[PDB]
Amino acid sequence: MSYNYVVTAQKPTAVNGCVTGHFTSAEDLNLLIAKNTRLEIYVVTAEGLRPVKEVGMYGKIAVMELFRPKGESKDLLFILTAKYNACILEYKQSGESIDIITRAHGNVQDRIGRPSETGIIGIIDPECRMIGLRLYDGLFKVIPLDRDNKELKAFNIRLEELHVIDVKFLYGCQAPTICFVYQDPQGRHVKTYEVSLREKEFNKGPWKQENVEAEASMVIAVPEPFGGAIIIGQESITYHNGDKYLAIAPPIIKQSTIVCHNRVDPNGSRYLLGDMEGRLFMLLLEKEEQMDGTVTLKDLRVELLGETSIAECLTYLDNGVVFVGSRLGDSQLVKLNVDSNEQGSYVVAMETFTNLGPIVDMCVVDLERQGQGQLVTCSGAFKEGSLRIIRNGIGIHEHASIDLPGIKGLWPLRSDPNRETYDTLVLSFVGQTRVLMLNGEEVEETELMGFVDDQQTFFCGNVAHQQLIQITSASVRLVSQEPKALVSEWKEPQAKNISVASCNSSQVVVAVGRALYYLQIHPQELRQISHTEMEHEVACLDITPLGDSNGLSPLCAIGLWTDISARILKLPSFELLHKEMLGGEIIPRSILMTTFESSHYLLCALGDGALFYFGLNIETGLLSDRKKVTLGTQPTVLRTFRSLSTTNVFACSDRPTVIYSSNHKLVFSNVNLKEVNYMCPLNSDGYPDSLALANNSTLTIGTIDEIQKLHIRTVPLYESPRKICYQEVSQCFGVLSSRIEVQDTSGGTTALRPSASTQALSSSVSSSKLFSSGEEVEVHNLLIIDQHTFEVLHAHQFLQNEYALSLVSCKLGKDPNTYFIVGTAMVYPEEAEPKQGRIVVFQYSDGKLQTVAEKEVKGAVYSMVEFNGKLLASINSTVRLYEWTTEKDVRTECNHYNNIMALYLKTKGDFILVGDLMRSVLLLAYKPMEGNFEEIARDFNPNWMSAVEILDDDNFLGAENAFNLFVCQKDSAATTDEERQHLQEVGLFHLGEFVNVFCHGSLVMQPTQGSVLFGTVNGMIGLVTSLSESWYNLLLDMQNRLNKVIKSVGKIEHSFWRSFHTERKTEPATGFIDGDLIESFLDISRPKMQEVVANREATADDLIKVVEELTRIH
């Protein structure tokens, strides 16, 4: 009986794979980007990447290849999952809908076999005769491509070589032939076999096993024109083919290992090479033509081209463009030129995509000190290290604050017919109208000609022909720029009001009730045109001359009031077209027609806060999509605002919301604001690119943030951040950091570039004498980062070979100071495990960093929380509790010894603690007895932990080694000595991510209990919450209903995916819910959504409301 819920807050952003080809059309260039469980399909364009399709799969993508057999009009896609799900995919565009269809699938894991060296490798023959897998040592699995084999049946062949580094299929080979680098005793070797599938054996390869260098790792199979194989080692590159043998050993490449490649030119004249450094190389093969003799290979050379992000994945695209898949850093779109720039680089970045990278550690802070957490991650590694500040929502910056408990509308006002700046904001009021002349930045309420102050303005637009309108309770007044008085003024042929106002900068379309007139601000006078009567009372109206119309406006739309409807119409005629019947007893408060890039949009807000959304047609215009949200609980006013190239829709509610744009879609993110009642663009000479926004009581004006649901602000550290703490009193962060350095010829160590610790504002080194006794090395630092500016205020460098692994910001003992304590450790590469380390206690003062105390240890300090005014640490395998002498020193109180390796600890308010490396988790208490540890209980399973949390008094979350999550609790049980001494795994669940950090916090607010945020190696940020048994049960059920209804991509079974799994056991998931899947619900059609129900009560869209309520936890 454990009941948890897990959702993704941020999808993985690291890039594991990327592959290029024609997957969308025979004539289309696509870049397929593989995150972890996310496949991203693009079309390469002049601008770069046209997003087209983003699906998620039920597994971690380990293999991703495009291929095209015969008769096949375009490329199909092969994908192997890490749980050995193999599938084959096809891009299907049902004219206007899109689908990725599974042409074949099946699971290719084998009970036999130990997962090999260099991990899964999936290759595919040039002729497409088969697919070659290397899942295990000794085996080589072959999946024969045939029209059938829709279940991907496969055979294994025995592989004599038990240790294969890399393999490819050779080109221009009659028989399917593989080429591989393998390792034995006495070096590495390149060797070949034909693959005859009609016998299920191998056969001899075309060329004799040559040798390759000790560190050979990549095999490139050169295309048909050249044929053969390139082998890439350290400091050396070689070419093999039959008796042909070519070798270069360019000094330049010794510096760092080549990690990745890519064919640039189809013939393979040219390849890209990726470095551990981020260096980019061109590999060039000098061809050679000899009449009556196809071609040969005279030479090959390497040229340094420049520098990218550390590249996992490289892919030449169109002309000089290269996509850079990055895992340690931000991914990027990059450009190659024939000419280098200034210090010498042929590489020029074009676009950078944000990778929250490896989140190595993180922490929550409301920096703005409101009631929302921002989250602050140590990210990336080496040159890509960064902090990322992550903040939900879209904010605005407030410039004035005028108390006006009334404002019932407001429109812009340029008082000078030249400047695109306005100096007035005439504003509807509680049955009034106030004008507002501005002295630039100042505020002033005065009169204005032909604009009634006694009456309630319902509009105020920017009517052309040198005129200013003010439509009122009564009727459309008129004022000039030239005359500036009472130029004209309409009035209802009966002394009845205008109910609903309209106007763009050229039209006027009011309503009287059921009535629908039409007036014009023609040169200096308002002339009448049409009149039509409607079934019911006009609720709301919209007109704006969309695209192909200068001021004068095409078709129309309206919501009415007893038949709560929205309908499509024309202009002077009012001829009714298609329509829609929305439900309930609440009338449409607002209707809208818009545009962004390539669609004309229609939305309709109701008084319950909900909104229905649809698209119209400038040419025709009819019905579109039908979905239903929950923005405010209050009626929503829709409006459109000035921003970047794509100006957008702002929704006014108790939950202010922006509606931007996705692919060609539209964003739905919160605006970080109390409540916005009405809202409009502005620009005054004293307030430019400003937005105006009145609430219950107050005008406000300011710019906008980004757009997404999450805003991220990066602090480039240029080295690898490791741990991170917030010392509030000091208004700064502590960050442990590590920089790499190389052996000097003095013997010392230099540095490869300026980092955050070398460009530090001030600085200091360890003096401490506790110890006495090319080549690369780490230099470690505590950095002091201002919380507002994110400047490195101070840098404290630790000793030669001292890694700093843990950090806390705490007060200790009676002592009233907040210290920064750092646990460290002396690492020497030969050693298995450090035997020496220290704890160091520091204070950061006015702007100072004092070494307040040190403390020898006989190990590596892995973690340390602040217990109860004491410092609980943890060294190599011993867990301790330090007391702070009044004499200001850390002295031992007690220690627990029964650990293989204590890596993590957390503290449940009370005297309770938890953690371990290969042996899952322990629970400990502090006994104010003799002041001792009592080991309360442990989990008796072989979990190699990576992260540990306490969700509550009895519930412990755990993440491990194998991308699983688990929960333990203490066994409430008779025989309270053994059953008591044991805690049971009451929840299991395969996440699919490696978790580095849990911490309590949330990114949201100012059903569910708790909020635990987690930070993963892939850039994925998730959330774990707790549930009621009934909520659990509701959701479990609905989890299963949902799986019947939803087509999973490669036809992977959801529950196969979520299955707690190791290469020693596989159990199904218990006590866990992916809201990821629950949430999936809303993307479903109401038909397929009805099925989800057939059965305290049962409903058809009660659940639609349960699920909404959830999406808002993050």
């Binding site: 340690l328 590694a381 890694y803 692994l805 298995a832 450090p834 390796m901 490696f994 580095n996």
Partner: peptide
């Protein structure tokens, strides 16, 4: 050196 391995593990593969 297992400390180095763990540091490597946090940055994965």
């Amino acid at each position: 050196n297992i400390t180095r391995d763990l540091i490597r593990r946090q940055i994965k593969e």
